[PDB]
Amino acid sequence: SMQEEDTFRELRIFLRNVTHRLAIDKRFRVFTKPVDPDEVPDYRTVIKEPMDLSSVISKIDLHKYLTVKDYLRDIDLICSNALEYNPDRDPGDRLIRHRACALRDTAYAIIKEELDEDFEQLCEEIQESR
Numbered sequence: 001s002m003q004e005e006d007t008f009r010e011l012r013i014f015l016r017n018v019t020h021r022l023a024i025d026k027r028f029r030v031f032t033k034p035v036d037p038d039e040v041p042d043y044r045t046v047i048k049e050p051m052d053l054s055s056v057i058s059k060i061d062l063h064k065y066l067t068v069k070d071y072l073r074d075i076d077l078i079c080s081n082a083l084e085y086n087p088d089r090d091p092g093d094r095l096i097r098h099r100a101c102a103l104r105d106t107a108y109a110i111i112k113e114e115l116d117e118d119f120e121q122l123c124e125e126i127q128e129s130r
């Protein structure tokens, strides 16, 4: 129905706003663009599904996300990719891990405050009917 397409349009507006707020935070610069194959040719041999915040905006506009749960699966993949690629005791690895944990925690905290639980349940029930 038109009402259901208006629901998904409201979801996309919300997801674009959350994603911009994460992308402008100086802590999260390293997560804003894909890893450059040149600079790190090893990355795509270890990390089997790369993800970054520029790819997330593109996915919103391609209508890939019909619930906030499917958006958070991609924010979780950004964070788990950085934990697995940078696992060592050295300062550079510990700094990226702390930033990746902060990106995940910040996204979940914005959604807990600003997303109504009944709006999410409506999107889930429309998705399950299709």
Ligand SMILES: CCOC(=O)[C@H](F)[C@@H](O)c1ccc(Br)cn1
Pocket: 016, 017, 019, 020, 057
């Ligand atoms: C409510 C009207 O919306 C706006 O003016 C935002 F700037 C919107 O256009 C937008 C936000 C983030 C990203 Br990323 C991409 N586009």
